[PDB]
Amino acid sequence: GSMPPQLHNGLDFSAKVIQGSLDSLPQEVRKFVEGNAQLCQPEYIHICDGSEEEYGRLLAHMQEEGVIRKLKKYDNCWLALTDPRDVARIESKTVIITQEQRDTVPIPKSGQSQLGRWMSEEDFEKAFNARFPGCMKGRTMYVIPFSMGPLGSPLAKIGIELTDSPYVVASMRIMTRMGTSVLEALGDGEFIKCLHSVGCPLPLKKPLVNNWACNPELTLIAHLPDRREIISFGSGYGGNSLLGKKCFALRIASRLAKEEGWLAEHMLILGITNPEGKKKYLAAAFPSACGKTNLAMMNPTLPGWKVECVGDDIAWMKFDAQGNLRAINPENGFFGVAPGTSVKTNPNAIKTIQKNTIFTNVAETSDGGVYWEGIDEPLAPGVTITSWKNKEWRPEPCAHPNSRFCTPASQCPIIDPAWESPEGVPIEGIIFGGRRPAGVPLVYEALSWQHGVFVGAAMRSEAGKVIMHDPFAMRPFFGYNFGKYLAHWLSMAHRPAAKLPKIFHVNWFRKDKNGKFLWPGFGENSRVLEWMFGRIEGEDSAKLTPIGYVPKEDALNLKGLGDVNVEELFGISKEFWEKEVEEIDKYLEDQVNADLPYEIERELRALKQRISQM
Ligand SMILES: Nc1nc2c(ncn2[C@@H]2O[C@H](COP(=O)(O)OP(=O)(O)OP(=O)(O)O)[C@@H](O)[C@H]2O)c(=O)[nH]1
Ligand SMILES: O=C(O)c1ncccc1S
Numbered sequence: 001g002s003m004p005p006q007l008h009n010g011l012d013f014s015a016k017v018i019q020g021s022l023d024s025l026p027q028e029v030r031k032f033v034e035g036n037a038q039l040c041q042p043e044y045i046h047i048c049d050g051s052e053e054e055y056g057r058l059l060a061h062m063q064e065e066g067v068i069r070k071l072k073k074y075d076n077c078w079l080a081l082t083d084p085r086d087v088a089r090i091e092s093k094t095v096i097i098t099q100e101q102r103d104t105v106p107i108p109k110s111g112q113s114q115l116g117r118w119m120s121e122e123d124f125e126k127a128f129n130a131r132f133p134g135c136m137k138g139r140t141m142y143v144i145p146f147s148m149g150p151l152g153s154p155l156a157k158i159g160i161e162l163t164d165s166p167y168v169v170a171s172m173r174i175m176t177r178m179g180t181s182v183l184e185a186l187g188d189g190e191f192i193k194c195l196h197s198v199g200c201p202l203p204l205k206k207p208l209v210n211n212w213a214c215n216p217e218l219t220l221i222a223h224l225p226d227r228r229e230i231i232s233f234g235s236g237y238g239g240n241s242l243l244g245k246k247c248f249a250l251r252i253a254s255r256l257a258k259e260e261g262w263l264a265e266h267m268l269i270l271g272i273t274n275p276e277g278k279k280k281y282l283a284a285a286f287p288s289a290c291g292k293t294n295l296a297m298m299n300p301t302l303p304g305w306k307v308e309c310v311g312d313d314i315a316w317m318k319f320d321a322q323g324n325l326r327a328i329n330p331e332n333g334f335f336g337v338a339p340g341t342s343v344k345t346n347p348n349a350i351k352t353i354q355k356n357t358i359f360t361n362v363a364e365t366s367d368g369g370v371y372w373e374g375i376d377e378p379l380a381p382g383v384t385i386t387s388w389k390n391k392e393w394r395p396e397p398c399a400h401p402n403s404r405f406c407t408p409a410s411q412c413p414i415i416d417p418a419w420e421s422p423e424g425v426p427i428e429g430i431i432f433g434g435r436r437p438a439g440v441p442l443v444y445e446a447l448s449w450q451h452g453v454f455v456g457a458a459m460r461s462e463a464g465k466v467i468m469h470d471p472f473a474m475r476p477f478f479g480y481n482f483g484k485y486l487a488h489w490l491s492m493a494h495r496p497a498a499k500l501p502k503i504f505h506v507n508w509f510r511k512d513k514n515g516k517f518l519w520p521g522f523g524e525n526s527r528v529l530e531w532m533f534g535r536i537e538g539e540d541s542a543k544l545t546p547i548g549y550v551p552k553e554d555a556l557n558l559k560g561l562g563d564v565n566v567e568e569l570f571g572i573s574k575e576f577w578e579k580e581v582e583e584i585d586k587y588l589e590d591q592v593n594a595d596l597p598y599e600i601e602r603e604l605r606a607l608k609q610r611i612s613q614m
């Protein structure tokens with residue numbers, strides 16, 4: 001862009017650019033960079049090119065400073081340990097700004113909305129002014145041009161993220177497609193403006209904990225969809241600071257999707273091939289901590305079946321002119337929960353993460369390896385453990401429960417051959433599910449599209465234990481009014497040509513009276529996928545129940561599993577389901593209230609009626 005006029009010398013930041021050129025940026029990109037440089041007052045501006053050289057030297061620099069540590073047991077892997085105050089998404093500090101609250105969340109009948117957190121324009125302006133002015137003093141502002149989705153995909157969207165965090169730059173290189181080719185692709189087109197600061201201008205006003213810059217007290221993750229802006233302050237945790245990951249991927253994108261006729265969802269996408277050489281793509285929405293990444297990367301136990309991964313967390317889906325629901329993974333890597341990852345639960349992740357991977361908040365072994373609860377593999381005698389709190393550790397956990405790996409998707413040994421195809425992959429089934437220790441069978445199939453949207457809406461999951469509502473696995477992620485999101489989903493049925501995928505609901509987590517899992521899960525979930533596959537093909541493998549279709553007796557391949565109690569696992573109790581429908585009723589009435597579509601109320605009535613006839 002052109003240099004700003006000025007009567008002095010404070011508006012043109014060209015002299016502070018240490019990589020790239022403001023003159024070579026598209027005009028609106030310059031305005032965005034320079035405007036926020038004027039506000040935040042960085043010492044330098046670094047326009048990222050996405051090169052390996054850039055990445056390597058950035059990592060070595062963070063290593064110099066003791067912000068990250070190299071994990072010498074592996075190939076170009078690194079470890080970051082955070083301030084324990086900055087370890088996860090903070091829902092109560094995550095907001096969406098719109099002129100009217102109702103555009104962001106439905107106005108609940110009696111209670112406080114659980115479906116979003118609206119902040120008024122006025123309150124945000126005040127919050128912004130109390131945080132950003134001068135916030136990058138002494139620091140580099142990195143400019144990260146990135147694509148969500150394969151570059152030039154009709155489904156891809158571009159952002160520009162400004163950050164003062166080299167951790168964010170590195171992790172964004174993994175999780176998005178970033179650098180100079182994106183700027184060239186963008187040209188004078190539209191982009192999402194993403195502004196991030198850790199909120200710790202130099203000289204530091206407060207002590208740095210574990211060399212991890214953050215400002216917990218002023219942490220605020222804001223989304224301004226009508227301005228195409230994401231503005232995040234105070235947190236370096238990836239869900240808050242890698243603005244592609246959730247802010248763009250789900251919150252802003254779900255609104256774009258609403259406006260433009262597509263869907264942005266908290267879904268893995270996998271391809272599954274059967275022993276007759278037929279392949280189908282499925283998407284699945286489970287809440288956080290409910291096993292999407294395991295499913296997405298599944299190593300199936302059934303001989304002759306293959307699973308390949310398109311993505312593990314976000315799906316952007318659009319019906320094409322032929323009526324196929326075409327999906328892309330708009331991400332470039334996996335940002336996956338480390339604890340519980342083992343050769344038993346996710347052998348393909350174990351494979352993936354030993355090269356070119358950044359770990360955050362896991363334990364470190366004395367030989368430069370990684371450790372966490374549930375890794376389920378022993379250390380040689382001699383090898384010792386430093387916890388994620390940077391203390392010597394022996395059996396508090398050694399790793400934070402939301403510690404994660406950040407790894408390139410291209411390295412997954414079962415990455416799908418079409419995982420970067422710009423036209424996307426055709427989704428033939430959508431799976432919902434969560435943690436239900438009681439009452440909910442292993443798998444059922446919705447009766448219709450409308451029933452299936454109700455099934456998404458009615459999702460609940462265990463957090464004494466609390467069973468929480470998490471509709472579509474989107475509860476913390478809706479970019480706009482959920483009622484209107486339901487209507488948008490329902491509207492897909494009225495597209496002539498649309499080939500509506502079959503909708504299923506699974507429960508890997510049903511327990512017997514002793515608290516033991518009824519179902520072995522993991523690779524054994526391939527048997528559930530086989531049933532779904534056949535159902536999509538039209539097989540006569542279902543029996544009707546009040547909640548939807550379930551597998552016929554003998555329909556599920558249980559060879560290996562005579563130990564498994566199909567009776568308790570597929571049991572449907574009138575008493576449980578009477579209570580279930582009442583809770584769903586109460587929830588939807590309060591939380592969706594005047595914006596609850598007729599079709600969803602109708603499905604509630606119908607389920608009530610079917611249960612009444614038991
Ligand atoms: N019993 C059982 N537990 C499973 C299964 N699949 C995954 N899990 C559990 O799910 C948890 C791991 O899931 P996460 O990686 O936290 O889930 P996610 O959906 O990818 O979460 P986000 O990345 O936060 O969106 C661990 O507690 C696993 O043991 C299964 O088939 N059976
Ligand atoms: O909480 C989430 O679902 C999540 N998922 C993937 C990666 C990061 C986060 S914050």
Ligand SMILES: [Mn+2]
Binds near residue numbers: 266288313
């Ligand atoms: Mn997630």
Ligand SMILES: [Mn+2]
Binds near residue numbers: 292293312313335336
């Ligand atoms: Mn995951």
Ligand SMILES: [Mn+2]
Binds near residue numbers: 490493599
């Ligand atoms: Mn309808």
Ligand code: NA
Binds near residue numbers: 067210
């Ligand atoms: Na640290």
